[PDB]
Design a protein around this ligand. Structure first.
Ligand SMILES: O=C(O)CCNc1cc(N2CCCN(C(=O)CO)CC2)nc(-c2ccccn2)n1
Ligand SMILES: [Mn+2]
Length: 294
């Protein structure tokens, strides 16, 4: 009856030698991680980049998300502080306990119950698709728009700085920010041009991920087309991906391999080419993501 968590995706804790270059490291872990779609990377313990966003002027209007909008078939400005105050108040009121005491398995189980619930309409807000050009990237950048301390220059030049990832494909982009709260989510989808993606959680409560390897991409799309609303069945992928929310247990019951992970603060998540992925936030957090080429 209740949610059965998918198996855990691979977690890598590279040494300082293996942490020298991201593309080299991702290429060596590819034989395993591409069989799970997503993977988690924990940097060395002393690798702690400072949060470099202009928090004094950071303002945004988040988007409203109704969890059961598909089942039921049916805009305030915040600062970073005011959104976090709303986010913590929502979670502590909903679970009747401090936000840091709510188990991740409980938020996960309750999230998927609310998505399919008809008698309970839960509505959250998500600060999504905030460009790193608006208020700066979460990573220090030698832009000249903000001071970089000597202890922060190694992070401004690091290859794991998402602003330093290669983004140009060989033929004949900047990171985006996401301010999450409890139950704010993103549905199943693949990146444009089947591109890689790397995600870094700067701070806050964990972000729960679900991933499907690329070898099962067609199987997921077939299951989606079979069970998604018939009114959205003939929609193109770029538009259907806006409303492709589906319980992972439903995919697993149809033979789709699904892996999960809890991305905690200071940890990376890499999605491989054509790896369908979805997830939700356990609470107030801040993430940065960019597509990169190999
Ligand atoms: O929350 C994170 O830390 C990043 C999760 N990853 C996203 C998030 C995203 N936002 C936020 C969630 C709502 N939402 C969807 O649910 C449909 O995707 C769309 C807007 N949009 C994308 C995306 C879109 C088009 C092509 C590639 N990617 N990826
Ligand atoms: Mn995406």
């Amino acid at each position: 009856a209740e949610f059965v968590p998918p198996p855990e995706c691979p977690v890598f804790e590279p040494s300082w030698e293996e942490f020298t270059d991201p593309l080299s490291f991702i290429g060596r872990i590819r034989p395993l991680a591409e069989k799970t779609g997503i993977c988690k990377i924990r940097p060395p313990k002393d690798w702690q980049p400072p949060f470099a966003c202009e928090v004094k002027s950071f303002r945004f209007t988040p988007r409203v998300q109704r969890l059961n909008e598909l089942e039921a078939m049916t805009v305030r400005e915040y600062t970073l502080q005011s959104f976090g105050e709303m986010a913590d108040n929502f979670k502590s009121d909903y679970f009747n306990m401090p936000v840091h005491m709510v188990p991740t398995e409980l938020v996960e189980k309750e999230f998927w119950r609310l998505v399919s619930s008809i008698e309970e309409d839960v509505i959250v807000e998500y600060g999504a698709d905030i460009s790193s050009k608006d208020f700066g990237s979460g990573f220090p950048v030698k832009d000249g728009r903000r001071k970089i301390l000597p202890e922060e220059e190694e992070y401004a030049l690091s290859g794991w700085n998402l602003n330093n990832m290669p983004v140009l494909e060989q033929s004949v982009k900047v990171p985006w920010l996401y301010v999450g709260m409890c139950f704010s989510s993103f549905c199943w989808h693949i990146e444009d041009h089947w591109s890689y993606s790397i995600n870094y959680l700067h701070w806050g409560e964990p972000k729960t991920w679900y991933g499907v390897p690329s070898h099962a991409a067609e199987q997921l799309e077939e299951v989606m087309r079979e069970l998604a609303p018939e009114l959205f069945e003939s929609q193109p992928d770029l538009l259907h991906q806006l409303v492709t929310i589906m319980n992972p247990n439903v995919l697993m019951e149809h033979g789709v391999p699904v892996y999960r992970t809890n991305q905690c603060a200071g940890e990376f998540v890499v999605t491989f080419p054509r790896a369908y992925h979805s997830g939700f936030n356990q609470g107030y957090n801040f993430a940065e993501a960019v597509n990169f080429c190999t």
